[PDB]
Design a protein around this ligand. Structure first.
Ligand code: HEM
Ligand SMILES: CC(C)CCC[C@@H](C)[C@H]1CC[C@H]2[C@@H]3CCC4=CC(=O)CC[C@]4(C)[C@H]3CC[C@]12C
Length: 468
């Protein structure tokens, strides 16, 4: 076994060989870390699934970790996770299967100019899917899944302009595969889950280059990713298809619960709904956009979308409460980490992690942290508030659902645009209400801890009726 040495943080080895604290950590991730915070302070080491994870819990120490250091490796763990879960060979250039910098691929196609067409495509696709008036009762999460999945799929992978059952099949397959994702990350083989195994292979088949080339309006991302698969990799046809499944999962898995919580919190709070309705009404008027189901589709520019402070605040506050990401980096060699709490010795191949849900729900940073306050990221005038403090010091990192530094989601700008577009269209098309307005906020499904946004454990019913 491993023993704590000179300078090294307090070590918690756990009661199980290999797993260590994994079981206890999985049982209640936030309370497990909070209990270790009381027992060991802001810096402690946990043996998890064969690894030794140093947790940095002081929000004032996040900057020393999120920096581009010569001792950190921020790809090796992610690349391995992807390989195991999606069933492709190593995408690490050191392994010689590809020479592609996937980070460069994502930057080039999810940001800058590429973002314009991608944003424009999402708005067209959403409107295609969403367009005597009667009240339709449905599960809010079920609704958000239908709408966001189909729109997201068509925006990223283009349209087959030749078929409704096929969209429904991909939808169902994705639900079946995504259901066992926490187990796949843990190390359990997909073979063990027959339904999910078949689902993953069916998803992969439809994303083969031969099937993708037959589609209209493919994203610059996938068309670049196809080109680089052929030019810079030695992957087989199915492996190439599985690299597109990684991108499908990445574009859907966090957007769907993110969309649910934003929609839910906006309707649940009458104050948030009234403000958002007025903002969308104001924005559409100034852009000369008329909401008509039979006429021409609405068009909003990136500039118009980025100037929605109320919606931005609603999304940010929705993510603040539901984000459960695990910010990880690995030690390249043995070194000493210098933090506000002290100096700690870290060994080679050790993991240095952040669980920013500890910060998002910190009462010292966010007063009444478990309450949804729609204007939490707004000032007196109604402009985005970027100043948050912690024990007197102004915080550089205060909101991290997409991560930060080099370990940041490249799809963040698109993610916020597509949620905004869904909310704009939902407010413009329908009259919205809940089955039980005075019903409790659903508990977060903790089985998805470390994988991004936590979905609700149980779905909430809601009603919608198109406007005249
Ligand atoms: C609410 C929406 C989303 C959330 C909260 C989210 C969150 C994240 C987080 C936390 C990571 C890992 C950050 C880290 O390295 O510690 C990540 C990675 C990534 N996300 Fe997002 N994401 C979202 C939407 C999207 C969308 C719409 C796309 C579209 C393509 C996307 C593409 C990716 C990709 C490709 C990576 C991996 C980057 C790399 O390893 O090189 N994400 N995202
Ligand atoms: C060309 C492809 C093979 C690119 C591969 C991208 C892989 C490495 C990326 C895409 C989406 C990323 C995940 C996004 C969601 C996420 C949230 C977290 O809080 C921890 C890290 C994870 C679990 C990420 C791990 C690495 C993933 C799976």
């Amino acid at each position: 076994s491993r023993r704590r040495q000179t300078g090294e943080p307090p070590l918690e080895n756990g009661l199980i060989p290999y797993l260590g604290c994994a079981l206890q950590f999985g049982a209640n991730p936030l309370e497990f870390l909070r209990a270790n915070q009381r027992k060991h302070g802001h810096v402690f080491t946990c043996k998890l699934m064969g690894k030794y994870v140093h947790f940095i819990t002081n929000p004032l120490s996040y900057h020393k970790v999120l920096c581009h250091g010569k001792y950190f490796d921020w790809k090796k763990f992610h690349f391995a996770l992807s390989a195991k879960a999606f069933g492709h060979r190593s995408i690490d250039p050191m392994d010689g299967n590809t020479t592609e910098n996937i980070n460069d691929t994502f930057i080039k196609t999810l940001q800058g100019h590429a973002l314009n067409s991608l944003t424009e495509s999402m708005m067209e696709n959403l409107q295609r899917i969403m367009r005597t008036a009667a009240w339709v009762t449905e599960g809010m999460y079920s609704f958000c899944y239908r709408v966001m999945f189909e729109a997201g799929y068509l925006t990223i992978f283009g349209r087959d302009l030749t078929q409704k059952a096929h969209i429904l099949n991909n939808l169902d397959n994705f639900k079946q595969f995504d259901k066992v994702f926490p187990a796949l990350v843990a190390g359990l083989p997909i073979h063990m889950f027959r339904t999910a195994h078949n689902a993953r292979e069916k998803l992969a088949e439809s994303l083969r280059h031969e099937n993708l080339q037959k589609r209209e309006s493919i994203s610059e991302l996938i068309s670049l990713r196809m080109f680089l698969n052929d030019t810079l990799s030695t992957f087989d046809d199915l492996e190439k298809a599985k690299t597109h499944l990684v991108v499908l999962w990445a574009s859907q898995a966090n957007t769907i619960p993110a969309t649910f919580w934003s929609l839910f919190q906006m309707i649940r709070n009458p104050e948030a709904m009234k403000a958002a309705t007025e903002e969308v009404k104001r924005t559409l008027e100034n852009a000369g956009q008329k909401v008509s189901l039979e006429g021409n589709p609405i068009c909003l520019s990136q500039a118009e979308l980025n100037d929605l402070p109320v919606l931005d605040s609603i999304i940010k506050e929705s993510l603040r409460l539901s984000s459960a990401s695990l910010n990880i980096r690995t030690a390249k060699e043995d070194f000493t980490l210098h933090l506000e709490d002290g100096s700690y010795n870290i060994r080679k191949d050790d993991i240095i992690a952040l669980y920013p849900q500890l910060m998002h729900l910190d009462p010292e940073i966010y007063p009444d942290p478990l309450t949804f306050k729609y204007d939490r990221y707004l000032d007196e005038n109604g402009k985005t508030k970027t100043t948050f403090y912690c024990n007197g010091l102004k915080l550089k990192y205060y909101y991290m659902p997409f991560g930060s530094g080099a370990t940041i989601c490249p799809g963040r700008l698109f993610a916020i645009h597509e949620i905004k577009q869904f909310l704009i269209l939902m407010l413009s098309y329908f009259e919205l209400e809940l089955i039980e307005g005075q019903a409790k906020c659903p508990p977060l499904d903790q089985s998805r801890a470390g994988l991004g946004i936590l979905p609700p454990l149980n779905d909430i019913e809601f009603k919608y009726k198109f406007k005249h």
